[PDB]
């Protein structure tokens, strides 16, 4: 009753604003986070390869729409990226055709509103790649810090320019092969989303970056069972398994993560049930003082790995046993994080 | 022989620096402010709260006018507020979740966003097809963001976890300056009430003072046991003071060329993730990983107040331009404004 | 950023018709529109208003009950229907694109115009509306309102506005003292209460035209009739 007519409207749009959020909220939510932490060549590939090997969980078709929109972001980028390119030059070219400009003015007017793909600005840069002088530059144009992928921005012109696209890998590929910091797997599961982040020679210090991380459904930690015999070829007096315990120890205590579930894969399991009968654990674990059975060794290993839990009672660890050749591996994770996930909305409302 | 007679060289150099400083610690502050008039007890109160971020909030920024703030949350979104009605003006979509760190340009027309891309991309808000767009993608860091401020429309200074700084030059998309010496990933920046000086913090123990135009580190402060986690300048643009994991706040001096205060307690063992001054000076605001923001008197070292009300760390701290009123956020999605 | 707007043509009095305005270089959805119809004789007047969302739809009371406006947002195309036009509905219609926020400029880009023809508050008021000016000479007009203009809020919510022959109106100045983008420095003004004034510090010949001042205080919105300073 006190607003003006404009500060009326400037409410509406506010709310409107809400709306879209609460909209996103509903739609971010699905997704599983995951963090994948642990030694360099542990077998994590094997994890994730499983992951990859059936490929039902491929380009989704809601992510195929996705695509459709990265390709639509790619190609602008991909049409002005030549016209930018020939028009920063230290050396310059002639053009075929003085109506190049022209076209030039277009293409950064349609690339400066950076809405959708016009097919008269993708015949500039089919002609434009066709021009001797636009590719003779390309030979200088390259000294710079140019995408690596940037030769298929524009060697594709001949399927990014039809309207109607038919989504490939490569579409995206065309920004995840940068490589940069952490990158994550993006997947499915029995129409669940999961995005899990594989972490890989950080450096630095092992965990002040990650606490941001915090809420993380679960961390997963991988140790090769069967590589227990192998010494750390970065320090020649530690045996692998003392430097994967040193991680975890480090990991699962951190006060980031003080309740966040982790899931431990121990791989190649029959690798290691088939070599503990000729090398005790003893080459790892002097005091180790078992029999050579799988039972023993493969539960000794566990509970050294548990024993390292300083919160036992509020943390719960989750142990797996893989192999190359197996089916448990890719449904095990997919239902122990639904479960994890089930224990901490429990947890939250205070009814477990 | 010559890396030996250079440390040799190196070290008699040190202990010089280290007796200049000594030699010029006359008083300490204990003994000058002894006979201030306290600030007392200072009740700060919440007037509006901010609601909406669906994510850990991890920056926050005062803009030029006292009435607009801009947020970014792990939600991928930054929104920019009216604190006065507890509007949203604009919510800008994301490319990437993962940020740390945001702008308010000084003239109203731009934001920054930053992360763990290692891209700072610039933002046009004044435009006149009604949406926001990326006017430059600033790439060529390699490592993370955990800092960005405008200094002038088209200038923008940037922190990276590869340990250096650089000065971009927006409008063409390169660097102009960058800034390196530092040994540890560069944790935070401050600029001074004047853009060609500015200092800046790393995971080193130690705070550089920066020259904007000569790309040089004037002065080195050293003191901290611990990763500084945020630094600024006292309002006269002569000092600044720091946070860090140590969990104490620690008070240096341009001129003295000299740490003059800490600010600490026996019963604190939480680290600092934000400070601040107030207008004057005389308040000195840290926020702690304890969920607490805590009230420094900035000439005495006593404690003031608390602003108790997140439940969850504090992220973000900032004092408006004209002294009027306190912003913080949390790990809560909640922002607050104080007074 | 364009708006054009298609549609008109002669009705016979009682008849009906659909304006509609294609909108192409913005974000459509975003934004709300108005309508405005200039009569020869009589100026600018306001029609509706749509808000940028829905369910807030404004009418004068002089078309209340036969104008009705619509958005389709996904054809980027705005509507007017009309129906038992009579001849005082004859005039040019504009589609004016508006948005609102904090800092916004209500009224930035106006169409062109779509002729209708039909066979047969707060008051703005003003003085001698033709005043004499030769170029390099400063202008001074000014205009009143019935009411005050100025909001417990501190703002005040008066708009000027030029129209050139065979132009569409374009804003110069909102809120008293902010100039629309691209309007020259030459370009002032100030005031308080219910009186406030325009000033050019030189007359160019690009600034001759009819001005116009509005409130945007309250609905309906009103226009005053127009100044013209041609020498």
């Known amino acids: 009753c006190t607003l003006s007519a404009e500060d009326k409207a400037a409410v509406e749009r506010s709310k409107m604003i809400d709306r879209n959020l609460r909209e996103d909220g509903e739609k971010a939510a699905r997704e599983v986070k995951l963090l994948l932490l642990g030694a360099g060549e542990s077998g994590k590939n094997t994890i994730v390869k499983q992951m990859k090997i059936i490929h039902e969980a491929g380009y989704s078709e809601e992510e195929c729409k996705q695509y459709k929109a990265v390709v639509y972001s790619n190609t602008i980028q991909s049409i002005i990226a030549i016209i930018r390119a020939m028009g920063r030059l230290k050396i310059d070219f002639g053009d075929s055709a003085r109506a190049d400009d022209a076209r030039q003015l277009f293409v950064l007017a349609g690339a400066a509103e950076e809405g959708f793909m016009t097919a008269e600005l993708a015949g500039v840069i089919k002609r434009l790649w066709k021009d001797s002088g636009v590719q003779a530059c390309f030979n200088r144009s390259r000294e710079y810090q140019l995408n690596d992928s940037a030769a298929y921005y524009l060697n594709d012109l001949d399927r990014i320019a039809q309207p109607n696209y038919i989504p490939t890998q490569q579409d995206v590929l065309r920004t995840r092969v940068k490589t940069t910091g952490i990158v994550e797997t993006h997947f499915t599961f029995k129409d669940l989303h999961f995005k899990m982040f594989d972490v890989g020679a950080q450096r630095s210090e092992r965990k002040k970056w990650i606490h941001c991380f915090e809420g993380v459904t679960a961390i997963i930690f991988c140790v090769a069972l069967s590589d227990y015999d192998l010494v750390l070829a970065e320090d020649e007096e530690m045996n692998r398994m003392h430097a994967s315990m040193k991680l975890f120890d480090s990991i699962c205590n951190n006060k980031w993560f003080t309740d966040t579930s982790i899931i431990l894969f121990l791989n190649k399991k029959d690798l290691f049930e088939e070599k503990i009968k000729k090398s005790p654990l003893t080459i790892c674990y002097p005091e180790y003082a078992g029999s050579n059975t799988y039972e023993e060794a493969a539960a000794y290993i566990q509970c050294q790995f548990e024993d390292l839990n300083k919160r036992k009672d509020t943390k719960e660890i989750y142990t797996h046993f893989t192999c190359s050749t197996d089916t448990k591996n890719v449904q095990f994770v997919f239902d122990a994080v639904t479960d994890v996930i089930i224990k901490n909305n429990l947890k939250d409302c205070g009814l477990f | 022989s010559e890396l030996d007679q250079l440390r040799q060289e190196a070290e008699q150099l040190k202990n010089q620096i280290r007796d200049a400083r000594k030699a010029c610690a006359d008083a300490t502050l204990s003994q000058i402010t002894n006979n201030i008039d306290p600030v007392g007890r200072i009740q700060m109160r919440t007037r509006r709260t901010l609601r909406g971020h669906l994510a850990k909030i991890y920056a926050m920024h005062w803009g030029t006018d006292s009435r607009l703030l801009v947020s970014a949350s792990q939600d991928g979104k930054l929104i920019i507020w009216d604190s006065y009605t507890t509007n949203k003006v604009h919510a800008i979509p994301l490319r990437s979740s993962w940020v740390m760190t945001c702008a308010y340009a000084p003239s109203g027309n731009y934001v920054a966003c930053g992360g763990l891309d290692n891209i700072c991309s610039i933002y046009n808000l004044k435009t006149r097809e009604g949406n926001v767009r990326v006017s430059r993608e600033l790439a060529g860091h390699t490592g993370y963001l955990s800092c960005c401020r405008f200094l002038d429309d088209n200038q923008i200074v940037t922190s990276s976890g590869d340990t250096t700084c650089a000065l971009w030059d927006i409008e063409t998309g390169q660097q102009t300056t960058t800034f390196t010496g530092h040994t540890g990933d560069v944790m935070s920046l401050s600029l001074a009430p004047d853009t060609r000086l500015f200092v800046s913090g790393a995971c080193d123990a130690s705070a550089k003072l920066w020259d904007v135009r000569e790309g040089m580190c004037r002065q080195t402060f050293t003191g901290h046991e611990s990763d500084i986690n945020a630094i600024c300048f006292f309002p006269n643009g002569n000092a600044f003071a720091t946070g860090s994991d140590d969990a104490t706040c620690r008070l240096f001096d341009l001129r003295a060329d000299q740490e003059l205060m800490t600010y600490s307690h026996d019963n604190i063992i939480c680290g600092i993730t934000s400070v601040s001054f107030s207008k004057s000076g005389r308040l000195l605001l840290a926020g702690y990983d304890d969920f607490n923001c805590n009230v420094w008197d900035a000439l005495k070292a006593d404690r003031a107040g608390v602003l108790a009300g997140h439940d969850n760390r504090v992220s973000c701290l900032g004092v408006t331009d004209d002294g009027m009123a306190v912003a913080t956020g949390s790990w809560d999605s909640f922002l607050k404004i104080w007074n | 950023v364009q708006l054009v707007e298609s549609g008109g043509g002669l009705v016979q009095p009682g008849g009906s018709r659909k304006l509609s305005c294609s909108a192409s270089?913005?974000?459509?959805?975003?934004?709300?529109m108005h309508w405005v119809r200039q009569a020869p004789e009589k100026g600018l007047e306001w029609v509706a208003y749509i808000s940028s969302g829905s369910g807030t739809i404004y009418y004068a009371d002089t078309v209340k009950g036969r104008f009705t406006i619509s958005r389709d947002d996904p054809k980027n195309t705005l509507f007017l229907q009309m129906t038992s036009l009579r001849s005082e509905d004859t005039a040019m219609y504009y589609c004016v694109r508006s948005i609102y926020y904090y800092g916004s400029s209500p009224f930035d880009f106006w169409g062109q115009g779509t002729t209708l023809t039909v066979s047969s508050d707060i008051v703005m008021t003003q003085a001698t509306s033709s005043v004499p000016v030769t170029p390099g000479e400063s202008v001074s007009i000014s205009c009143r309102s019935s009411?005050?203009?100025?909001?417990?809020?501190?703002?005040?919510?008066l708009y000027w506005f030029l129209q050139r022959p065979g132009q569409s109106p374009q804003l110069l100045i909102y809120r008293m003292s902010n100039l629309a983008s691209g309007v020259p420095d030459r370009f002032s003004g100030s005031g308080s209460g219910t009186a406030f004034t325009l000033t050019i510090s030189r007359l160019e010949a690009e600034d001759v035209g009819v001005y116009y001042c509005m409130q945007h205080l309250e609905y309906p919105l009103t226009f005053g009739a127009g100044t013209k300073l041609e020498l």
């Open positions: 270089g913005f974000a459509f959805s975003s934004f709300g």
């Open positions: 009411k005050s203009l100025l909001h417990s809020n501190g703002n005040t919510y």
